[model samples]
Target chain A: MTPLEAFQILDLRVGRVLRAEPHEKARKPSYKLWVDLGPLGVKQSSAQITELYRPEDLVGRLVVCAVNLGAKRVAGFLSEVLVLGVPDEAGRVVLLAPDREVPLGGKVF
Target chain B: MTPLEAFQILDLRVGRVLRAEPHEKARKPSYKLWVDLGPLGVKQSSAQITELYRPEDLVGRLVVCAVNLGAKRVAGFLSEVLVLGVPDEAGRVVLLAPDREVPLGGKVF
Candidate 1:
């Protein structure tokens, strides 16, 4: 399939972090986060963003997530979505966010 | 390929808008933007974000872009990349941005 078609099949969505906590069992530093996705319900993610963000800083924040990548087990946590981010100069993850508030479960285009 | 593989194939990157101006010829109100992608140099996009963002408001702002979808012409402008955004409540475009400053051309994962 074409790249554009491939992109269309990839479901990227906006969600709000409802809860976050350190993933104590992760080999790499990570957070186990519960995100409120509005109509799609809440989803969980194992995000390796502990370097630049604390669990407290993540709650009630808007985040962009890969919603259709399906579930995966990370240190026994059922991570259902992929929190999206870009790397900083030092390679620490920095989350992607909307410039302003948007309703949760909005599609990214 | 699986959706995860497809997501991997998508080349999402961070960029800084160097310049922005109204795309006068576009059927819908749009901005013609020049974005600096660090290692990738500058790329252009015809972004339909006039509803919430003025051209002046966009210069030097960090943005998430889809860089490998190939170029397409919009009106008379050659759009080299797709600037990514999500919809606000009224369905107006709202840009996607890094939670904090990051170098240009950083790949989003």
Candidate 2:
């Protein structure tokens, strides 16, 4: 399939972090995040974003997520969505966000 | 194929806008942007993000792109990559970005 078709097949959405905290069970450093995706409801994720963020820092921030990748068990937590990010100069994960405020659950194109 | 595999198939990267100008020939209001993707070099796109952004406002901004989408001819301009975005509360297009500065051409995951 073409990349265009592949893009259409995946669902990406905007959401806000309702809560975040350390995932003590995970061997690797990670956080358990609760995101409010408007119509999609609050979904959970185990994100390895501890390099540059704290639980209090991530709360209320807008984020992009791959919502239809199905779920995976990360450190015994059900991660319902893939939180999207890119690497910084130091090779640490930095979250992707809308430059301006966008409605929750808005699809990315 | 699985949505997880589809996500792996798509090559998403971060790039900085070197320049942007009105795409006067396009039927819809859009901008012809030149993006510097570091190791990937410079690429062009016809982006319909005019409602909330001006051409001048886009320069020097870090943006996410779908680099493996192949090319499309938009109003005679060869758009080499897709600049990714989501919709605002008013339904206007809003650009997606890394919350902090990142190295150009960094792959998104």
Candidate 3:
């Protein structure tokens, strides 16, 4: 599929992290996140963002997530969405956010 | 195609706005932005973010862009990439950004 069509097919949304903590059971260092997606409700994610962020650093932060990617079990944890991020120069994951606060669950266009 | 596959097909990258000006010719209010995508070089976009940001406020800001979506001419300006954003509660466009400094042109995963 073309990139434009791909973009349309992927459901990305803006959400805020309602809670976060270290995912101790994961093979890789990770964080267990509870994201509040407004009308979509709160969903969980096991994000491998430990290289750059602590659990406390993520709470209440606005984040962009791919919510329709289907769920996956990571370390027996049901990760309901993929929190989107890009790698920094040092290869640490850096989360994506809206430049300003937007209503939770707003679709990215 | 599955949303997971669609995510892989789309190429999102981090870039910094080097310059910005009003796109007076666009039927809808917009801005002409010159973005520096590090190793990918500079690319241009016609972003409809006039509602929340000014030209002077955009320069040097990091932005996420869908770079592989073929270019489109908007009011005679060749928009080479789609600067990504989500709508706020009042329907104003709010641009997406990396939560911290990331290498320019780094792919979003």
Candidate 4:
């Protein structure tokens, strides 16, 4: 498939973290983040980002999330979207974001 | 069908912009960026990011790119990867990047 088709198939949108807290039940240390995706509504994600971030630090941060590809249950919480992250030097997750703020739910292309 | 699978299907990787210059022949104002993808070598992309950036401003910047998109010839240049960007207030491109420095070609998850 063409890159254009892949872009259409994968629905990535910008969102803001409304809240983030530890997911105590997770096998791997993770944060339960509630992201506000504008028209797409808020979606939950269990992000493995405890090494470099705290709940307060993650909240209010703009993030990129894949809205489709369905959901996955992590530590019993249904993660509706995948929050994208690039690996840091220590192999820890560091989130991706637009250089500046943009309208929520705006697709990334 | 699952978020985990989408992660595999999409080969997104972190790259460093080695060089960036204005694409003079393009129909729309754009930048031709040569990105260093570490082990995956360098790839070129024609990014429509002139609205918010210039050549010097984008050079040496870390960016996320879809390396498996094959290639597309744009303005006579063989663009090899797709630089990911989100829309801005004026509907212009705003590139996404990791929150900090990381090894090049590190896969995004």
Each candidate's TM vs. the true structure? 0.98, 0.98, 0.97, 0.95
Cα lDDT computed for each candidate against the true fold: 0.94, 0.93, 0.93, 0.90
Model 4 Cα shift for residue A103 (angstroms)? 0.7
State residue B106's C-alpha deviation in candidate 4, in Å.
0.6
The reply for model 1, stretches above 4 Å from the true place, is none
Tens digits of per-residue lDDT for model 3 on A17-100? 989988999999999999999999999999999997888889999999999998999998999999999998789999999988
For model 2, report DockQ: 0.80
Q: Of the pair 1 and 4, which is ahead by DockQ?
A: 1
Among all windows of 10 consecutive residues in model 1 chain B, the one with the lowest summed lDDT is B1-10
Record all residue pairs in model 3 with backbone atoms less than 3 Å apart, i.e. clashing.
none
* Maximum-lDDT candidate: 1
- Name model 2 segments beyond 4 Å from true: none
- The clash numbers for all candidates, in the given order, read 0, 0, 0, 0
lDDT (10s digit) by residue, model 3, range B5-82: 998998999999999999999999999999999999999999999998999999999999999888999999999998
lDDT of 1 by residue, B4-97 (tens): 8778888999999999999999999999999999999999999999998998899989999999897999998999999999999999999999
TM-score of chain B of each: 0.97, 0.97, 0.97, 0.93
Per-residue error (Å), model 4, residue A2: 6.3
Give lDDT tens digits, candidate 2, residues B1-109.
6787778788899999999999999999999999999999999999999999998899999999999887999999999999999998787999999988999999998
Distance from true location, Cα of A44 in model 2, Å: 0.6
Error in Å for residue A102 of model 2? 0.9
DockQ of each: 0.81, 0.80, 0.87, 0.60
